[PDB]
CSV table of C-alpha atoms in Angstrom, one decimal:
chain,number,residue,atom,x,y,z
A,1,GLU,CA,-36.1,-3.2,16.1
A,2,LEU,CA,-35.2,-3.5,12.2
A,3,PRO,CA,-35.0,-0.6,9.7
A,4,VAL,CA,-38.3,-0.3,7.7
A,5,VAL,CA,-36.5,-1.0,4.3
A,6,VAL,CA,-35.0,-4.3,5.7
A,7,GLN,CA,-38.4,-5.4,7.1
A,8,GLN,CA,-39.9,-4.7,3.7
A,9,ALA,CA,-37.1,-6.9,2.1
A,10,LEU,CA,-37.6,-9.8,4.5
A,11,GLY,CA,-41.4,-9.9,4.1
A,12,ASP,CA,-42.8,-13.0,5.7
A,13,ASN,CA,-39.9,-15.2,4.5
A,14,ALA,CA,-37.7,-14.9,7.5
A,15,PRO,CA,-39.2,-16.2,10.8
A,16,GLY,CA,-35.8,-17.2,12.2
A,17,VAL,CA,-34.1,-13.8,11.6
A,18,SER,CA,-32.0,-12.7,14.6
A,19,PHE,CA,-31.1,-9.0,14.7
A,20,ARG,CA,-28.0,-8.8,16.9
A,21,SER,CA,-24.5,-7.2,17.2
A,22,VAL,CA,-22.0,-8.8,14.7
A,23,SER,CA,-19.6,-10.7,17.0
A,24,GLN,CA,-17.1,-13.5,17.5
A,25,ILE,CA,-19.6,-15.9,15.9
A,26,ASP,CA,-17.4,-16.6,12.9
A,27,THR,CA,-16.5,-14.1,10.2
A,28,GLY,CA,-17.0,-17.4,8.2
A,29,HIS,CA,-20.8,-17.0,8.3
A,30,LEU,CA,-20.9,-13.6,6.6
A,31,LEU,CA,-22.4,-13.1,3.2
A,32,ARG,CA,-21.7,-10.2,0.7
A,33,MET,CA,-23.8,-9.1,-2.2
A,34,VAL,CA,-21.9,-7.4,-5.1
A,35,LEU,CA,-23.8,-5.0,-7.5
A,36,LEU,CA,-22.8,-5.7,-11.1
A,37,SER,CA,-23.7,-4.6,-14.5
A,38,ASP,CA,-23.2,-4.8,-18.3
A,39,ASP,CA,-25.0,-3.6,-21.5
A,40,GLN,CA,-27.8,-6.1,-20.9
A,41,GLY,CA,-28.6,-4.7,-17.4
A,42,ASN,CA,-28.0,-5.0,-13.7
A,43,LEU,CA,-27.3,-8.1,-11.6
A,44,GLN,CA,-26.4,-8.9,-8.0
A,45,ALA,CA,-24.1,-11.7,-7.0
A,46,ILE,CA,-24.1,-13.2,-3.5
A,47,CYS,CA,-21.1,-15.0,-2.0
A,48,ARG,CA,-19.3,-15.7,1.2
A,49,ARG,CA,-17.8,-12.5,2.5
A,50,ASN,CA,-14.2,-13.6,2.6
A,51,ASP,CA,-14.3,-15.5,-0.7
A,52,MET,CA,-13.0,-13.9,-3.9
A,53,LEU,CA,-15.5,-13.3,-6.7
A,54,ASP,CA,-14.2,-14.8,-10.0
A,55,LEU,CA,-16.0,-12.5,-12.5
A,56,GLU,CA,-14.5,-14.5,-15.5
A,57,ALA,CA,-16.2,-17.6,-14.2
A,58,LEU,CA,-19.5,-15.8,-13.6
A,59,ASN,CA,-19.5,-14.1,-17.0
A,60,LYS,CA,-18.7,-17.4,-19.0
A,61,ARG,CA,-21.4,-19.1,-16.9
A,62,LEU,CA,-24.1,-16.5,-17.7
A,63,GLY,CA,-22.9,-15.5,-21.1
A,64,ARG,CA,-22.4,-11.9,-19.9
A,65,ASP,CA,-19.8,-9.1,-19.5
A,66,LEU,CA,-20.5,-8.0,-16.0
A,67,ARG,CA,-18.3,-5.7,-14.0
A,68,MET,CA,-18.6,-3.6,-10.8
A,69,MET,CA,-21.7,-1.4,-11.1
A,70,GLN,CA,-20.9,2.2,-11.7
A,71,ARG,CA,-20.3,4.0,-8.4
A,72,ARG,CA,-22.9,6.7,-9.0
A,73,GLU,CA,-25.6,4.0,-9.3
A,74,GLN,CA,-24.5,2.2,-6.2
A,75,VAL,CA,-24.5,5.4,-4.3
A,76,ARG,CA,-28.0,6.0,-5.5
A,77,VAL,CA,-29.4,2.6,-4.5
A,78,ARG,CA,-27.7,2.7,-1.1
A,79,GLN,CA,-28.8,6.3,-0.3
A,80,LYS,CA,-32.4,5.4,-1.0
A,81,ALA,CA,-32.2,2.4,1.3
A,82,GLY,CA,-30.5,4.5,4.0
A,83,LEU,CA,-27.8,1.9,4.4
A,84,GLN,CA,-23.9,2.1,4.1
A,85,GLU,CA,-23.8,-1.3,2.4
A,86,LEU,CA,-26.6,-3.3,0.9
A,87,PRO,CA,-26.9,-6.6,2.7
A,88,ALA,CA,-27.6,-9.9,0.8
A,89,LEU,CA,-31.4,-9.4,0.5
A,90,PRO,CA,-32.3,-9.6,-3.1
A,91,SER,CA,-35.7,-7.7,-2.9
A,92,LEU,CA,-33.9,-4.6,-1.7
A,93,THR,CA,-33.3,-3.9,-5.4
A,94,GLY,CA,-35.4,-6.5,-7.2
A,95,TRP,CA,-32.5,-7.0,-9.6
A,96,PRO,CA,-31.6,-10.4,-11.1
A,97,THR,CA,-29.6,-12.3,-8.5
A,98,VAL,CA,-27.3,-15.3,-8.4
A,99,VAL,CA,-25.8,-17.2,-5.4
A,100,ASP,CA,-22.4,-19.0,-5.4
A,101,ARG,CA,-22.9,-22.6,-4.2
A,102,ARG,CA,-20.5,-22.3,-1.2
A,103,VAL,CA,-23.2,-20.0,0.4
A,104,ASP,CA,-25.6,-22.9,0.6
A,105,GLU,CA,-23.2,-25.1,2.5
A,106,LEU,CA,-23.5,-22.9,5.5
A,107,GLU,CA,-26.1,-23.9,8.2
A,108,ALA,CA,-26.6,-20.3,9.3
A,109,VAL,CA,-25.8,-17.0,7.4
A,110,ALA,CA,-24.8,-13.6,8.8
A,111,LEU,CA,-25.6,-10.3,6.8
A,112,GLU,CA,-23.9,-7.0,7.7
A,113,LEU,CA,-26.1,-3.8,7.6
A,114,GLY,CA,-23.0,-1.7,6.8
A,115,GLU,CA,-22.1,0.5,9.8
A,116,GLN,CA,-24.2,0.2,13.0
A,117,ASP,CA,-22.0,-2.8,14.0
A,118,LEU,CA,-25.3,-4.6,13.9
A,119,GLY,CA,-26.2,-7.6,11.6
A,120,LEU,CA,-28.8,-10.2,10.8
A,121,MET,CA,-28.2,-13.9,11.3
A,122,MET,CA,-30.7,-16.4,9.9
A,123,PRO,CA,-31.0,-20.2,9.3
A,124,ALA,CA,-30.1,-21.6,5.9
A,125,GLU,CA,-33.8,-22.5,5.3
A,126,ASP,CA,-34.7,-18.8,5.6
A,127,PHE,CA,-32.0,-17.6,3.3
A,128,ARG,CA,-33.1,-20.3,0.8
A,129,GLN,CA,-36.6,-18.8,0.8
A,130,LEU,CA,-35.3,-15.2,0.3
A,131,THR,CA,-33.3,-16.5,-2.7
A,132,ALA,CA,-35.7,-19.1,-4.0
A,133,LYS,CA,-35.3,-17.7,-7.6
A,134,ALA,CA,-31.7,-16.8,-7.6
A,135,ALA,CA,-29.8,-19.3,-9.8
A,136,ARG,CA,-26.9,-21.1,-8.2
A,137,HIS,CA,-23.5,-21.2,-10.0
A,138,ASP,CA,-19.8,-21.7,-9.1
A,139,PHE,CA,-18.1,-18.4,-9.1
A,140,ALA,CA,-16.5,-17.6,-5.7
A,141,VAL,CA,-13.1,-18.9,-4.7
A,142,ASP,CA,-11.9,-20.0,-1.2
A,143,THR,CA,-8.6,-18.0,-0.9
A,144,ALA,CA,-6.9,-20.6,1.4
A,145,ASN,CA,-6.2,-22.6,-1.8
A,146,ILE,CA,-4.5,-19.6,-3.6
A,147,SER,CA,-0.8,-20.1,-2.7
A,148,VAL,CA,0.7,-16.7,-3.0
A,149,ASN,CA,4.5,-16.9,-2.8
A,150,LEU,CA,5.1,-15.1,0.4
A,151,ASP,CA,8.2,-16.8,1.7
A,152,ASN,CA,10.1,-18.5,-1.2
A,153,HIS,CA,12.1,-16.0,-3.2
A,154,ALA,CA,14.2,-18.9,-4.5
A,155,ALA,CA,11.3,-19.9,-6.8
A,156,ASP,CA,10.7,-16.3,-8.1
A,157,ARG,CA,12.8,-16.6,-11.3
A,158,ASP,CA,11.1,-19.7,-12.4
A,159,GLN,CA,7.6,-18.6,-11.5
A,160,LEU,CA,8.1,-15.3,-13.4
A,161,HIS,CA,9.5,-17.1,-16.4
A,162,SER,CA,6.6,-19.5,-16.5
A,163,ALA,CA,4.1,-16.7,-16.3
A,164,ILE,CA,5.9,-14.8,-19.1
A,165,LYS,CA,6.0,-17.9,-21.3
A,166,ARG,CA,2.5,-18.8,-20.7
A,167,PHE,CA,0.9,-15.3,-20.8
A,168,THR,CA,3.0,-13.3,-23.3
A,169,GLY,CA,4.8,-13.7,-26.6
A,170,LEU,CA,8.1,-12.6,-25.0
A,171,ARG,CA,11.1,-14.8,-25.5
A,172,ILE,CA,12.8,-15.8,-22.2
A,173,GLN,CA,16.3,-14.3,-21.9
A,174,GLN,CA,19.0,-14.6,-19.2
A,175,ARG,CA,18.0,-11.4,-17.3
A,176,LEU,CA,14.4,-10.4,-16.5
A,177,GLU,CA,14.9,-6.8,-17.6
A,178,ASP,CA,16.0,-8.1,-21.0
A,179,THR,CA,13.2,-10.7,-21.3
A,180,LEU,CA,10.7,-7.8,-20.6
A,181,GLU,CA,12.5,-5.7,-23.3
A,182,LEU,CA,13.2,-2.9,-20.9
A,183,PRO,CA,15.6,-0.1,-21.8
A,184,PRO,CA,18.9,-0.2,-20.1
A,185,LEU,CA,19.4,1.7,-16.9
A,186,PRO,CA,20.4,5.3,-18.0
A,187,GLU,CA,23.6,6.7,-16.5
A,188,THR,CA,21.4,9.3,-14.6
A,189,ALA,CA,19.9,6.5,-12.6
A,190,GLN,CA,23.0,4.4,-12.1
A,191,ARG,CA,24.6,7.4,-10.5
A,192,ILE,CA,21.5,8.0,-8.2
A,193,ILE,CA,21.7,4.3,-7.2
A,194,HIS,CA,25.4,4.6,-6.3
A,195,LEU,CA,24.8,7.8,-4.3
A,196,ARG,CA,21.7,6.3,-2.6
A,197,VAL,CA,23.2,3.1,-1.3
A,198,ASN,CA,26.3,5.2,-0.5
A,199,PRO,CA,26.5,7.3,2.7
A,200,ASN,CA,29.9,8.9,2.0
A,201,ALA,CA,29.7,12.6,0.9
A,202,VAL,CA,28.2,15.9,-0.2
A,203,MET,CA,25.0,17.7,-1.3
A,204,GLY,CA,27.1,18.9,-4.2
A,205,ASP,CA,27.3,15.3,-5.5
A,206,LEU,CA,23.5,15.2,-5.8
A,207,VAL,CA,23.6,18.7,-7.4
A,208,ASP,CA,26.1,17.3,-10.0
A,209,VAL,CA,23.8,14.4,-10.9
A,210,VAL,CA,20.8,16.6,-11.3
A,211,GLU,CA,22.8,19.0,-13.5
A,212,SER,CA,23.8,16.1,-15.8
A,213,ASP,CA,20.2,15.1,-16.6
A,214,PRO,CA,18.7,18.4,-18.0
A,215,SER,CA,15.1,17.0,-17.8
A,216,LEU,CA,15.6,16.1,-14.1
A,217,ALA,CA,17.2,19.5,-13.6
A,218,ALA,CA,14.0,21.0,-15.2
A,219,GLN,CA,11.5,19.2,-12.9
A,220,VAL,CA,13.6,19.7,-9.8
A,221,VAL,CA,13.5,23.5,-10.4
A,222,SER,CA,9.8,23.1,-11.3
A,223,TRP,CA,9.0,21.2,-8.1
A,224,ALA,CA,10.8,23.9,-6.1
A,225,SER,CA,9.1,26.9,-7.8
A,226,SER,CA,5.6,25.4,-7.8
A,227,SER,CA,2.6,26.5,-5.6
A,228,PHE,CA,3.1,23.6,-3.2
A,229,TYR,CA,6.6,24.9,-2.3
A,230,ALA,CA,5.9,28.5,-3.5
A,231,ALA,CA,6.4,29.7,0.2
A,232,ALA,CA,10.1,29.4,-0.9
A,233,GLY,CA,10.2,32.5,-3.2
A,234,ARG,CA,12.7,33.0,-6.1
A,235,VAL,CA,14.3,29.7,-7.1
A,236,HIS,CA,17.9,30.6,-8.1
A,237,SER,CA,19.5,27.3,-9.4
A,238,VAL,CA,19.5,23.6,-9.0
A,239,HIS,CA,21.7,23.8,-5.9
A,240,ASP,CA,19.1,26.2,-4.4
A,241,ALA,CA,16.1,23.9,-5.3
A,242,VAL,CA,17.8,20.9,-3.6
A,243,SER,CA,19.6,22.3,-0.6
A,244,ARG,CA,17.0,25.0,0.4
A,245,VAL,CA,13.5,24.2,-0.9
A,246,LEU,CA,13.1,20.5,-1.4
A,247,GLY,CA,15.9,18.6,0.5
A,248,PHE,CA,18.6,16.1,-0.2
A,249,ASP,CA,16.8,12.8,0.5
A,250,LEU,CA,13.5,13.9,-1.1
A,251,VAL,CA,15.2,14.9,-4.4
A,252,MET,CA,17.2,11.7,-4.4
A,253,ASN,CA,14.2,9.6,-3.8
A,254,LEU,CA,11.8,11.3,-6.2
A,255,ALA,CA,14.6,11.3,-8.9
A,256,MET,CA,15.1,7.6,-8.5
A,257,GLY,CA,11.3,7.1,-8.7
A,258,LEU,CA,11.1,9.0,-12.0
A,259,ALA,CA,14.2,7.3,-13.5
A,260,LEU,CA,13.0,3.8,-12.8
A,261,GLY,CA,9.5,4.6,-14.3
A,262,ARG,CA,10.7,6.2,-17.7
A,263,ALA,CA,11.4,2.5,-18.7
A,264,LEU,CA,7.6,1.9,-18.5
A,265,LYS,CA,4.4,2.9,-20.3
A,266,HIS,CA,1.3,4.3,-18.5
A,267,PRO,CA,-1.0,1.5,-17.5
A,268,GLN,CA,-4.0,1.2,-19.8
A,269,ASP,CA,-6.5,0.3,-17.2
A,270,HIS,CA,-7.1,1.0,-13.5
A,271,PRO,CA,-9.3,-0.3,-10.7
A,272,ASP,CA,-12.1,2.2,-10.2
A,273,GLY,CA,-12.4,3.6,-6.8
A,274,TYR,CA,-8.7,3.0,-6.0
A,275,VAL,CA,-6.2,5.8,-5.7
A,276,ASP,CA,-4.0,6.6,-8.7
A,277,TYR,CA,-0.4,5.3,-8.9
A,278,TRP,CA,1.4,8.4,-7.6
A,279,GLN,CA,-1.1,8.9,-4.8
A,280,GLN,CA,-0.4,5.4,-3.6
A,281,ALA,CA,3.3,5.9,-3.9
A,282,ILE,CA,3.3,9.2,-1.9
A,283,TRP,CA,1.0,7.9,0.8
A,284,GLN,CA,3.2,4.9,1.6
A,285,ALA,CA,6.4,6.9,1.2
A,286,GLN,CA,5.3,9.4,3.8
A,287,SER,CA,3.8,6.6,6.0
A,288,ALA,CA,7.0,4.6,6.0
A,289,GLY,CA,9.1,7.6,6.8
A,290,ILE,CA,6.9,8.5,9.8
A,291,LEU,CA,6.9,5.0,11.1
A,292,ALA,CA,10.7,4.8,10.7
A,293,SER,CA,11.2,8.0,12.6
A,294,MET,CA,9.1,6.8,15.5
A,295,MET,CA,11.1,3.6,16.1
A,296,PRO,CA,13.5,3.5,19.1
A,297,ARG,CA,17.1,5.0,18.6
A,298,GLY,CA,19.0,1.7,18.7
A,299,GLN,CA,16.6,0.1,16.2
A,300,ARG,CA,15.7,2.9,13.8
A,301,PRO,CA,15.8,2.3,10.0
A,302,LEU,CA,17.3,4.8,7.6
A,303,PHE,CA,14.6,7.4,6.8
A,304,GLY,CA,15.7,7.8,3.2
A,305,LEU,CA,15.4,4.1,2.4
A,306,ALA,CA,12.1,3.8,4.2
A,307,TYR,CA,10.6,6.7,2.2
A,308,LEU,CA,12.1,5.1,-1.0
A,309,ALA,CA,10.7,1.7,-0.2
A,310,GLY,CA,7.3,3.4,0.3
A,311,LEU,CA,7.6,5.4,-2.9
A,312,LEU,CA,8.5,2.3,-4.9
A,313,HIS,CA,6.3,-0.3,-3.1
A,314,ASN,CA,3.8,-0.6,-5.9
A,315,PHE,CA,6.1,-0.3,-8.9
A,316,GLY,CA,5.1,-3.8,-10.1
A,317,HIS,CA,1.7,-2.3,-11.0
A,318,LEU,CA,3.5,-0.5,-13.9
A,319,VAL,CA,5.3,-3.6,-14.9
A,320,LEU,CA,2.3,-5.9,-14.8
A,321,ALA,CA,0.1,-3.4,-16.7
A,322,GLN,CA,2.8,-3.2,-19.4
A,323,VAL,CA,3.8,-6.9,-19.6
A,324,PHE,CA,0.4,-8.6,-19.2
A,325,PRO,CA,-2.1,-6.0,-20.4
A,326,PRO,CA,-5.2,-8.2,-20.8
A,327,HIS,CA,-4.5,-10.0,-17.5
A,328,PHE,CA,-4.0,-6.6,-15.8
A,329,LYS,CA,-7.5,-5.7,-17.0
A,330,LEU,CA,-8.8,-8.8,-15.2
A,331,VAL,CA,-6.9,-7.9,-12.1
A,332,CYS,CA,-8.4,-4.4,-12.2
A,333,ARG,CA,-12.0,-5.7,-12.6
A,334,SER,CA,-11.4,-8.2,-9.8
A,335,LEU,CA,-10.0,-5.6,-7.4
A,336,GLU,CA,-13.2,-3.5,-8.0
A,337,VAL,CA,-15.5,-6.4,-7.2
A,338,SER,CA,-13.4,-7.8,-4.3
A,339,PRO,CA,-11.8,-4.7,-2.6
A,340,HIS,CA,-11.4,-6.8,0.6
A,341,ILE,CA,-9.1,-9.3,-1.2
A,342,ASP,CA,-5.4,-8.2,-1.7
A,343,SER,CA,-4.0,-7.9,-5.1
A,344,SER,CA,-1.4,-10.6,-4.3
A,345,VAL,CA,-4.2,-13.1,-4.1
A,346,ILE,CA,-6.0,-12.0,-7.3
A,347,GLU,CA,-2.7,-11.8,-9.2
A,348,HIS,CA,-1.5,-15.2,-8.0
A,349,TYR,CA,-4.8,-16.7,-9.1
A,350,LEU,CA,-4.7,-15.1,-12.6
A,351,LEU,CA,-0.9,-15.1,-13.3
A,352,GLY,CA,0.8,-17.3,-10.7
A,353,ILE,CA,3.0,-14.3,-9.8
A,354,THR,CA,2.5,-11.0,-8.0
A,355,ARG,CA,3.5,-7.3,-8.5
A,356,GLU,CA,5.8,-7.7,-5.5
A,357,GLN,CA,7.7,-10.6,-7.1
A,358,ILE,CA,8.2,-8.9,-10.5
A,359,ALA,CA,9.2,-5.5,-9.1
A,360,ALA,CA,11.6,-7.0,-6.5
A,361,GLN,CA,13.3,-9.1,-9.2
A,362,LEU,CA,13.8,-6.0,-11.4
A,363,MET,CA,15.1,-4.0,-8.4
A,364,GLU,CA,17.7,-6.6,-7.6
A,365,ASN,CA,18.9,-6.9,-11.2
A,366,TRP,CA,19.1,-3.2,-11.3
A,367,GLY,CA,21.4,-3.1,-8.2
A,368,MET,CA,19.0,-1.3,-5.9
A,369,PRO,CA,19.6,-1.4,-2.1
A,370,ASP,CA,18.5,-4.7,-0.7
A,371,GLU,CA,16.5,-2.7,1.9
A,372,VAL,CA,14.2,-1.5,-0.9
A,373,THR,CA,14.2,-4.8,-2.9
A,374,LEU,CA,13.4,-6.9,0.1
A,375,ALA,CA,10.8,-4.5,1.4
A,376,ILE,CA,9.1,-4.6,-2.0
A,377,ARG,CA,9.2,-8.4,-2.1
A,378,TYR,CA,7.9,-9.1,1.4
A,379,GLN,CA,5.5,-6.1,2.1
A,380,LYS,CA,2.6,-8.5,1.9
A,381,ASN,CA,4.2,-11.0,4.4
A,382,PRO,CA,4.1,-9.7,8.0
A,383,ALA,CA,6.0,-12.9,9.2
A,384,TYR,CA,8.9,-12.3,6.9
A,385,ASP,CA,12.0,-12.7,9.2
A,386,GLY,CA,14.9,-12.4,6.8
A,387,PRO,CA,17.4,-9.6,6.1
A,388,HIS,CA,16.0,-6.1,6.2
A,389,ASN,CA,12.6,-7.4,7.4
A,390,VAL,CA,11.9,-4.1,9.3
A,391,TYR,CA,11.5,-2.3,5.9
A,392,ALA,CA,9.0,-4.9,4.7
A,393,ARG,CA,7.2,-4.6,7.9
A,394,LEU,CA,7.1,-0.7,7.8
A,395,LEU,CA,5.2,-1.1,4.4
A,396,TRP,CA,2.8,-3.8,5.8
A,397,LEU,CA,2.0,-1.7,8.8
A,398,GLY,CA,1.5,1.4,6.7
A,399,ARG,CA,-0.8,-0.4,4.4
A,400,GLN,CA,-3.0,-1.5,7.3
A,401,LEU,CA,-3.2,1.9,9.1
A,402,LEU,CA,-3.9,3.8,5.9
A,403,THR,CA,-6.6,1.4,4.6
A,404,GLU,CA,-8.4,1.3,7.9
A,405,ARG,CA,-8.8,5.1,7.7
A,406,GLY,CA,-10.3,4.8,4.2
A,407,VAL,CA,-7.3,5.6,2.0
A,408,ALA,CA,-8.3,3.6,-1.2
A,409,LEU,CA,-5.2,1.3,-1.6
A,410,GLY,CA,-7.3,-1.8,-1.4
A,411,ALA,CA,-7.6,-4.7,1.1
A,412,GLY,CA,-6.3,-4.2,4.6
A,413,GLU,CA,-6.3,-6.0,8.0
A,414,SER,CA,-6.0,-5.1,11.6
A,415,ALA,CA,-2.5,-4.1,12.7
A,416,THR,CA,-2.0,-6.6,15.4
A,417,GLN,CA,-0.3,-5.8,18.7
A,418,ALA,CA,2.5,-8.3,17.8
A,419,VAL,CA,3.7,-6.0,15.1
A,420,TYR,CA,3.8,-2.8,17.3
A,421,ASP,CA,5.7,-4.8,20.0
A,422,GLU,CA,8.2,-6.1,17.4
A,423,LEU,CA,8.8,-2.6,16.0
A,424,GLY,CA,9.1,-1.0,19.5
A,425,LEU,CA,6.2,1.4,18.6
A,426,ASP,CA,3.4,2.6,20.9
A,427,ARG,CA,0.0,2.0,19.3
A,428,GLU,CA,-1.8,5.1,20.6
A,429,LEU,CA,1.0,7.3,19.4
A,430,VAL,CA,1.1,5.7,16.0
A,431,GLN,CA,-2.7,6.0,15.8
A,432,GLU,CA,-2.5,9.8,16.4
A,433,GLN,CA,0.2,10.3,13.7
A,434,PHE,CA,-1.9,8.3,11.2
A,435,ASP,CA,-5.1,10.1,12.0
A,436,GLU,CA,-3.2,13.3,11.2
A,437,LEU,CA,-1.5,11.8,8.1
A,438,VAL,CA,-4.9,11.0,6.6
A,439,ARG,CA,-6.1,14.6,7.3
A,440,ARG,CA,-3.3,15.7,5.0
A,441,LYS,CA,-4.9,14.0,2.0
A,442,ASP,CA,-5.1,17.3,0.0
A,443,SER,CA,-1.4,17.8,0.2
A,444,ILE,CA,-0.7,14.0,-0.6
A,445,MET,CA,-2.8,14.6,-3.7
A,446,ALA,CA,-1.0,17.8,-4.7
A,447,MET,CA,2.5,16.2,-4.3
A,448,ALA,CA,1.2,13.3,-6.4
A,449,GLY,CA,-0.2,15.6,-9.1
A,450,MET,CA,3.2,17.3,-9.5
A,451,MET,CA,4.8,13.8,-10.0
A,452,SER,CA,2.1,13.0,-12.6
A,453,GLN,CA,2.3,16.3,-14.6
């Protein structure tokens, strides 16, 4: 029955091991082993699957500086074992091992062998024997006690202010943008914002705006004459780049995206294994636009705002990186070790606020369309019912479909039937558009590179 490497790892220490298909026997019985390292060496940490690993707690506790083991080494150890994920059997590597005390409270434990949909269940006594020399410590957190603010915008101003007071040296001012010492909104952007919420007139209005900001005019002409759009030919002017090559909405949306981000520094850290900022923006922008276009006629959101919401969904990443640099480092390390836990949870646990809150508040103060502001604020809340909830739901759905196909945005869940029924979407049809969207990875990456450059 069992792969020779797992047999070897079990030895004679697991008489009650049951090699069965992982099933409706609770997701609450599953364990997870995380491979960690620092300058002193390698270490494996075992915790309940759905718990969040608190690296800070583990490091203080052990007097170490552990972080996710480098990808190359994890690939190596898993390729040798012939497994897609190493289950929580310490002798697979022989590395020093620790177990979080919640694991021992379980009567029976389930290990996942990675991919075959198969798993091992065993009685607590057997797991205790396999981990007889693994020290116990408290370092994994039950996420049901982390109260991410998903439904209470009214408290946002105060929670953001408390976080700023407590975790920065910034003085609290009347408007968030001023507290955060952000440059004022340049005229360029204010005009884009007017045009964008406005559905009143011409292409030539957009051309005027682009011609007023010579750096925007430069990039626009660049975008249009690059290899990605090179099938265009000779790019004559700004009018030509916008009306013929790129398009009205795209230029408005990308322009807005660049304008809102000139106010911010480049993040100084990043979660390894996660897509870069512009790739995440482009993925969700394209996703949201596809989903909007597939909704029924009498219920269809505005494509331009859906794409914009997608492009901006993660803008708070830039704000947190700049406003709370050392805590953003902790967020990055935590995202690497618990990629199955959403950033909202990790951020709430560390800062008491999320990237959704901070971005949404800036969008509102800047006079962005409520569609975008509200979408950004509630993208992590699939039950959000308030004004413009369809936009927040387009982001949530997008996130789940992209992450289940392996786009590295972080944690994702199953898109439930309830959501497809609510949005008047056919599941099979959506699934075929998203299988195709993921196959267009190379062109997502190219569009994002041109935004980075």
